[PDB]
């Protein structure tokens, strides 16, 4: 009981899920076969069978067979259920319409089918964790379809969308602004909390803090898995301030539209420089609000902070947390909106994050992961909107979407709704 | 004669669990349940907090309350989770979501039927129920929401029975909830007209005890919960143990509540000295009465200089003579008349109980109906008005069915409360 269903969609979602599940197996001591070497704390992520095997409460989706075949031929082949590991026929080809209308529509029903198998297997569900990237085709279109179908299927159940938005000047595809702006509809209406995990900020963080001249998607997914593990350790393990998914989403979401929330992790330091630092609670909390210490490429000082939820882990104590928060309040370079003087949420867990052997993170007594709703989030949205305006100003690449099954009114409505979101960020950041 | 306890929310359940640990301390009850008390003074009134079993063991008369099964999990798997009765554990499938609306109208309403069941059996299975005790926090979702639902739902069925709340009041500096003003207001307006005593515990004071009074290297929620637990044990020590000047919760309410809506109290514990400074303190009646009115030992963070003391209660535990305690306690008023209410003679009532807490010379629990509470109520009201001004997290509450003028009515109740505080503060003869 007290579980959470993990859904991974697309390329980015699938590698993020692989890293997440290897990290969870490292946490709870399950071998890749699926067996053990009050240890039932795994019940939140692994369903236990009478044989003693622990099958993850996960669901992989990708329109292209390669990634799921990689998973099925990797070390954790026996860990995962043969079902709930769906393989597509042919990829969405970086096309939101392809993933949402003409190909994702005929496997979204199997997606909900296996998700419902997970739901009936589980008993104390708190919500879904949808890992994907809005830049691509599958993760945008099929992710949006799956989220909006889950919205009507499971009602007001929490749906935390850990999404890799396109980064400002690091880019992978030319239709990335299109896919992001189109998927923003579902990520805005059928998602309670959406967490940015753009690749640029993680790249700068790895370059400047992890002292690794050549990190890759492997290390980026390791970091994302560390972030999700830190966020959900409150319900995974015992802690001082046990906080649930709904418990922190209600405090991170001030308005139904105003729910996209940036994320950060600390301390993320390589082992070479990790023993050179007083990795105290105050130090890690200060490093959280560093503009280069976060996982989203947006300067937080360019907007009013609205609500910060802090997840502390390890030997961290509530008074060091409170002293750090008081110093943060005194440091008014980061300022809170006038109508939310509290602006803070605290969740303390007693379990330090177990590092991934062979990874780049260092073993630390305490760690902190912060998720903030702030009006500075408008920078990346406005940049993506301007890219959309440049691309749509003369109908570039729109023929692909239209010939694959979406209207132009959908593009125009996407741009208009994103402009409305732009205005809403600034409206709620305005002084009373 | 008996007090039936209820814990609500994560904070309430943890505090109540370690409070039951404290109770088992001086009642000599094993975690399993067996009684190995060294003296039968621990069994004389064990029925007040425990109900006996056939095996010679004793069961806490406590009901647990949380939409989150995790806190029940921690409590039951803890050192003293053996003690609690299994069926009293009442929980749901999903957490409160830190929402007063969810905890009070949607998730708590469908769950409070079983809570009423269990508390009614625990309440009418005793010879003469002295009262109901609740432990929760007003900033939480299920501790505040479902706790106030329980309070209002039990008040009508037991009107003559005394019912009290150890509300762990929140504060913006230690704000772990951004819906803190909403939850605090929605809980406090219910507690105003549904509780005989609503004692307030503040996290900033709890931690300032851990530094400025204790100098603890690694203070934890265990230490904070034991502070609250010692407060709870002290407020009712007189019922469970004999004393020179006995008192009960009814007498404390009578002596501390001058007017029906004036039932919010300061709290304080003594003796509290840092482990390195306990050598040099001569622990005596004067030292304890000094520590009662010392800032380092108050359980709530507010400035009493700005306010006036309507009434106070001093529950002393240990072997003492009344001769020095009463003269000291009048002595403090004589030279602090500038900080005490003039139109009431002898604002503070004392009670003496012979049995002291285990490992203590002598203790004292301080319960003060000071008028400085309006400062903190105004502080929470200002942020509540700011949040309500802009639909700040209002849709979460309104989507659970609460009407919009609920918040207006709650804020009007709080405004009336602070106005009454101010006008009894500045009232003259």
């Amino acid at each position: 009981m007290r579980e959470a269903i993990c859904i991974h969609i697309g390329q980015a979602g699938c590698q993020v899920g692989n890293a997440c599940w290897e990290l969870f197996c490292l946490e709870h001591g399950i071998q890749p076969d699926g067996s053990m070497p009050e240890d039932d704390a795994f019940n939140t992520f692994f369903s236990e069978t009478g044989a003693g095997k622990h099958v993850p409460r996960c669901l992989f989706l990708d329109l292209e067979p390669t990634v799921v075949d990689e998973v099925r031929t990797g070390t954790y082949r026996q860990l995962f259920n043969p079902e709930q590991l769906v393989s597509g026929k042919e990829d969405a080809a970086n096309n939101y319409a392809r993933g949402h209308y003409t190909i994702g529509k005929e496997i979204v029903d199997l997606a909900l089918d296996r998700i419902r198998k997970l739901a009936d297997n589980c008993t104390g569900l708190q919500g879904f964790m949808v890992f994907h990237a809005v830049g691509g085709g599958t993760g945008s279109g099929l992710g949006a379809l799956l989220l909006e179908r889950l919205s009507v299927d499971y009602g007001k159940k929490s749906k935390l969308g850990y999404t890799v938005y396109p980064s400002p000047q690091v880019s992978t595809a030319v239709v990335e602004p299109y896919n992001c702006v189109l998927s923003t509809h579902s990520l805005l209406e059928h998602t309670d909390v959406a967490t940015m995990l753009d690749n640029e900020a993680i790249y700068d963080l790895t370059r400047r803090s992890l002292d690794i001249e050549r990190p890759s998607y492997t290390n980026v997914n390791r970091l994302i898995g560390q972030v999700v593990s830190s966020l959900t350790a409150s319900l995974r393990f015992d802690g001082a301030l046990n906080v649930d998914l709904t418990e922190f989403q209600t405090n991170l979401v001030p308005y139904p539209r105003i729910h996209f929330v940036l994320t950060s992790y600390a301390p993320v330091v390589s082992a070479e420089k990790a023993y050179h630092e007083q990795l105290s609670v105050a130090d890690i909390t200060n490093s959280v609000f560093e503009p280069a210490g976060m996982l989203t490429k947006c300067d937080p000082r360019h907007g009013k902070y609205m609500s910060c939820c802090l997840m502390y882990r390890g030997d961290v104590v509530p008074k060091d947390v409170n002293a750090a928060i008081a110093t943060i309040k005194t440091k008014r370079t980061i300022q809170f909106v006038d109508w939310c003087p509290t602006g803070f949420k605290c969740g303390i867990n007693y379990q330090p994050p177990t590092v991934v052997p062979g990874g780049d993170l260092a073993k630390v007594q305490r760690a902190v992961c912060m998720i903030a709703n702030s009006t500075a989030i408008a920078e990346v949205f406005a940049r993506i909107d301007h890219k959309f305006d440049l691309m749509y100003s003369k109908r570039a690449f729109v023929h692909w979407y239209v010939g694959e099954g979406m209207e132009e009114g959908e593009f125009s409505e996407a741009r208009e709704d994103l402009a409305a979101l732009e205005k809403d960020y600034e409206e709620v950041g305005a002084e009373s | 004669r008996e007090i039936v306890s209820c814990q609500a929310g994560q904070c309430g359940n943890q505090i109540g669990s370690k409070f039951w640990e404290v109770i088992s301390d001086e009642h000599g009850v094993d975690p399993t349940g067996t009684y190995q008390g060294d003296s039968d003074l621990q069994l004389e009134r064990i029925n007040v907090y425990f109900d006996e079993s056939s095996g010679g063991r004793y069961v806490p008369r406590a009901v647990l309350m949380d939409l989150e099964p995790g806190t029940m999990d921690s409590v039951r798997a803890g050192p003293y989770g053996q003690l609690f009765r299994p069926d009293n554990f009442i929980f749901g499938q999903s957490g409160a979501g830190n929402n007063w609306a969810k905890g009070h109208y949607t998730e708590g309403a469908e769950l409070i039927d079983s809570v009423l069941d269990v508390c009614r059996k625990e309440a009418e299975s005793c010879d003469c129920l002295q009262g109901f005790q609740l432990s929760h926090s007003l900033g939480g979702g299920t501790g505040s929401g479902m706790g106030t639902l329980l309070i209002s739902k039990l008040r009508e069925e037991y009107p003559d029975r005394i019912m009290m709340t150890f509300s762990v009041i929140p504060s913006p500096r230690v704000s772990d909830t951004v819906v803190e003003p909403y939850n605090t207001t929605l809980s406090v307006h219910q507690l105003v007209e549904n509780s005989d005593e609503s004692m307030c515990i503040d996290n900033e004071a709890l931690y300032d005890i851990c530094f400025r009074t204790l100098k603890l290297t690694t203070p934890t929620f265990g230490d904070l919960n034991h502070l609250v637990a010692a407060v709870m044990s002290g407020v009712t020590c007189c019922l469970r143990f004999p004393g020179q000047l006995n008192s009960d919760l009814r007498k404390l309410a009578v002596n501390l509540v001058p007017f029906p809506r004036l039932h919010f109290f300061m709290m304080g514990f003594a003796p509290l000295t840092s482990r390195g400074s306990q050598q040099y303190r001569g622990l005596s009646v004067a030292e304890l009465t000094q520590q009662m009115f010392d800032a380092k030992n108050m359980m709530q963070a507010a400035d009493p200089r700005h306010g006036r003391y309507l009434t106070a209660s001093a529950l002393f535990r240990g072997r003492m003579s009344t001769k020095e305690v009463d003269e000291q306690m009048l002595n403090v008023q004589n030279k602090n008349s500038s900080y005490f209410i003039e139109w009431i003679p002898n604002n503070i009532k004392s009670s003496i109980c012979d049995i002291p807490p285990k490992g203590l010379k002598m203790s004292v629990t301080f319960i003060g109906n000071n008028t400085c509470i309006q400062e903190m109520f105004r502080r929470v009201g200002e942020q509540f008005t700011g949040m309500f001004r802009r639909k700040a997290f209002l849709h979460w509450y309104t989507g659970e069915g609460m009407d919009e003028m609920e918040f207006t009515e709650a804020e009007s109740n709080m405004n009336d409360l602070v106005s009454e505080y101010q006008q009894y503060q500045d009232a003259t003869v």
């Binding site: 400047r208 503009p291 280069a292 300067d299 000082r301 002293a323 008081a326 005194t330 440091k331 370079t333 | 004071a205 300032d208 400025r212 004067a286 009465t289 000094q290 009115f293 010392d294 800032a295 963070a301 400035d303 009493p304 200089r305 000291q328 002595n331 403090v332 030279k335 602090n336 900080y339």
Partner: peptide, 24 residues
């Protein structure tokens, strides 16, 4: 390395709520 907007470094002792009722 993001732009360094100047910030006054305010390190002051946090002694608070220091009051004492007059006894003797």
């Amino acid at each position: 390395a993001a732009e360094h907007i100047p910030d006054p470094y305010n390190d002051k002792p946090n002694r608070g709520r220091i009051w004492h009722f007059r006894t003797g």
